[PDB]
């Protein structure tokens, strides 16, 4: 049961999506015909339908912190929030993602990796920020030429995020594109970046 939230909203961590008792059981989810709370920050969720179908029928579920805020990101700023993902008249963000930006005027090249040791496959989501102007790009990630590299044994993307001013949606001209994969046991997923990576915080083992 998702109430006013979509699968996107529930699985990404929309603050207005307070479905947190989770569970391991339904076969079917639930949605409204036109859910109001999904991707609060505008952008494109890659393979949405495919996720909804693969997310139908879960026998065992749990939400765990794949990259914990306090220990995983020492060289970067993790406080990024938006007035588009607002919770109680107060700018917030996705609960299962982290908006990494610069700390002390730098964005150092990062390299993070998670080895699946849960016997079962873990659902990993992330994002890539596409700023509306080069100024925001420079202000946030301290480079003009960013790369985001998500690599596993069944998935391999080499992102080159581009500046584009898009029509204002939810008061924003910038976009965060949403991506996901299923990580099989024994496999290890490696994130590498120098900007624009909305990093995963919580994943899902099903």
């Amino acid at each position, epitope marked *: 049961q998702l109430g006013n939230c979509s699968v996107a909203g529930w699985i990404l961590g929309n603050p207005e999506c307070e479905l947190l008792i989770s569970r391991e059981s339904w076969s079917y989810i639930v949605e409204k015909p036109n859910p109001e709370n999904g991707t609060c920050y505008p952008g494109h969720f890659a393979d949405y339908e495919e996720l909804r179908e693969q997310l139908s029928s879960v026998s065992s579920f749990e939400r765990f912190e794949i990259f914990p805020k306090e220990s995983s990101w020492p060289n970067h700023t993790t406080t*990024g*929030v*938006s*007035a*588009s993902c607002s919770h109680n008249g107060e*700018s917030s963000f996705y609960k299962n993602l982290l*908006w990494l*930006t*610069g700390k002390n*005027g*730098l964005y150092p090249n990062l390299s993070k990796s998670y080895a699946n040791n849960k016997e079962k496959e873990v659902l990993v989501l992330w994002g890539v920020h596409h700023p509306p102007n080069i*100024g*925001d790009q*420079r*202000a*946030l990630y*301290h*480079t*003009e030429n960013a790369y985001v590299s998500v690599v596993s044994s069944h998935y391999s993307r080499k992102f080159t995020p581009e500046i584009a001013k898009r029509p204002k949606v939810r*008061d*924003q001209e910038g976009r965060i594109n949403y991506y996901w994969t299923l990580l099989e046991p024994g496999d290890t997923i490696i994130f590498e970046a120098n900007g624009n990576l909305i990093a995963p915080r919580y994943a899902f083992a099903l």
Partner: antibody
Amino acid sequence: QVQLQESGPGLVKPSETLSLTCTVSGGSISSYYWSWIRQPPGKGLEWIGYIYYSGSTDYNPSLKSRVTISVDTSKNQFSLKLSSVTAADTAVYYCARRRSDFETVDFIYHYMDVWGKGTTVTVSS
Amino acid sequence: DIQMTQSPSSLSASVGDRVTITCRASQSISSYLNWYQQKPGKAPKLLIYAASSLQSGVPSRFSGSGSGTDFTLTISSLQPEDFATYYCQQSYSIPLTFGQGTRLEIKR
């Protein structure tokens, strides 16, 4: 803690080129915009241009043809060159740091917080 | 592209007085305006960024306000040190334009 100092000649002959250097102390050129501003005597401020630490430039359209701003990370310095100078280029020239800042990523603004002491340049024969 | 216009050009106020000076943008700029204080023979000093944010090190008697096209710099209790030319500056787009300046004279 960070301080800037303009260096270069005070007198420059007409048609020749003005060359000013700014030296950064108490900090590094890393990740900021580095700009030049000038002020003719009794005449308010005119932005010349800036350079971003990665090399990118942005100049004032009224000077675009004559101006070259360069940065030298090797020596904590950045320079101004203004070609074919005329008496209209007689002014006090300032180097300054333009930094980006924000309280939340939804609102990202710039400002020039660190200024040099200004160097006086006269174009005369 | 954005022209900046200050008002008034010059004014004289007494010590203790509340002085307000205005900056105007030719087209909207929102909160992308900065204020500077220039004292004779010194470089310009940043007072307020983002239209209303007081810079660290600046006395709290300075306040910035406004959004869109019309802005105001306010000194709650004028002090003799505050004798200077005051400039507004837009940070909205290139080529970063300044106002023409307001000359604050102290009346005694």
